[PDB]
C-alpha cells in the first residue's frame, strides 16, 4: 500500500490574521468569485511523496528525531503572490516569506535528509516558501495578477497590527500521510 505523504509547518492563525483574510478574500472574489478560504494554514517543506504503509511510522520517528532539535524562529510573510500547482488545476493566493527564508532552507535540509533516508524525492530546487490563504479550481492567474494583486498588496501594506505578518513565530512541524497526521514541537 502507497500513502501520499507531505511535511509542512502549520501556522497558528492570530485573530488579526483572520480579520486580514476577512478583508482580502472578498476583495479577491470581486475578480474570481469562486475563490475558497483556506481552513487551516501551512508552509510546505516537501513535495507530496508516496511511502509504503510499513514505513509511515518509522518515517515519522525519523522526522521527529530531526525536527524536535531544530529551534523555533520568526519570519516575515507580507508579500502577496499568486501560485499554481504543477498541473494548473489549482490557483492560490499566498504570502511569500522574505526574512526567515534562511531558516526555512535549513529546515528543508533536515527534511530532505529524512527523505533520502527513505528513498523519497527531495524538495523543489528553487523554493518560494509561502502561506496559502485562498484557492480556486483552474488557472486564474490572468484575473488575479495585475490590478487585483496590487490591491491585495495595498490591503496588506495598510494592515494593522503589521507585526502579525512581520514576525510570524514557528512552533511545530507536521506530516500528513494518507488520512493520518503527526505533529512535533520545534525546540
Ligand atoms: Cl469564478
From Swiss-Prot:
One of its GO terms (biological process) is U6 snRNA 3'-end processing. It is an enzyme of class 4 (lyase). AMP binds at residues 42-44, 124, 126-132. It is linked to Poikiloderma with neutropenia: A genodermatosis characterized by poikiloderma, pachyonychia and chronic neutropenia. The disorder starts as a papular erythematous rash on the limbs during the first year of life. It gradually spreads centripetally and, as the papular rash resolves, hypo- and hyperpigmentation result, with development of telangiectasias. Another skin manifestation is pachyonychia, but alopecia and leukoplakia are distinctively absent. Patients have recurrent pneumonias that usually result in reactive airway disease and/or chronic cough. Changing residue 42 to A: Abolishes exoribonuclease activity. Does not restore U6 snRNA processing when expressed in deleted mpn1 yeast cells. Increases the accumulation of unspliced pre-mRNAs when expressed in deleted mpn1 yeast cells. Interacts with PLRG1, CDC5L and PRPF19. The chain holds residues 79 to 265 of 265 of the full protein. The lineage of its organism: Eukaryota, Metazoa, Chordata, Craniata, Vertebrata. Transmembrane segments: none annotated. This is U6 snRNA phosphodiesterase 1. Its main location: nucleus. The active site is at 42 (proton acceptor), 130 (proton donor).
